[PDB]
A paper describes a structure:
Nbs are derived from natural llama heavy-chain antibodies that are devoid of a light chain and in which the heavy-chain variable domain (VHH) exclusively mediates the interaction with the antigen. The VHH domain is structurally similar to the IgG VH domain, with three complementary-determining regions (CDRs) that are responsible for antigen binding. We describe the introduction of cysteine residues at conserved framework serine positions in a Nb specific for human complement component C5 and subsequent site-specific labelling with Hg derivatives and structure determination by SAD and SIRAS. Hg incorporation did not perturb the structure of the Nb or its antigen-binding capacity.
We were able to crystallize both native [name] and [name] Ser85Cys labelled with PCMB. Since we obtained the crystal structure of both native [name] and PCMB-labelled [name]-C85 we can compare their structures.
Numbering used by the authors: 2 to 119
Amino acid sequence: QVQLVESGGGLVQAGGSLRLSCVVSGSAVSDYAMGWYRQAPGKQRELVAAIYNSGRTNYVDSVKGRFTISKDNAKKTVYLQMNSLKPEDTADYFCNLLGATTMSNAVWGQGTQVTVSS
């Protein structure tokens, strides 16, 4: 069984910042591209940022210049620095192998909660 353990959420005012982290067992982080996803209540999970083994990063338009994804292969950890937080960023955040949303039966962690207040 794969364990995905997410941390770093919080309640912040608009404009604040958080750093998420996800530790994943097995070889996913060290060997494959990883994504950070978010799910607002009653909505489906959506990819927000991706980190490839090359070091390339890709961000959805709404987070470009605010969020930064990275992964430490040795520590099997993926990070998401979240700056300049906006109310639209409120959601539960999850990390996974890139493409996991295409699999009906993908295992997800519990995620970490991010709330951006006024």
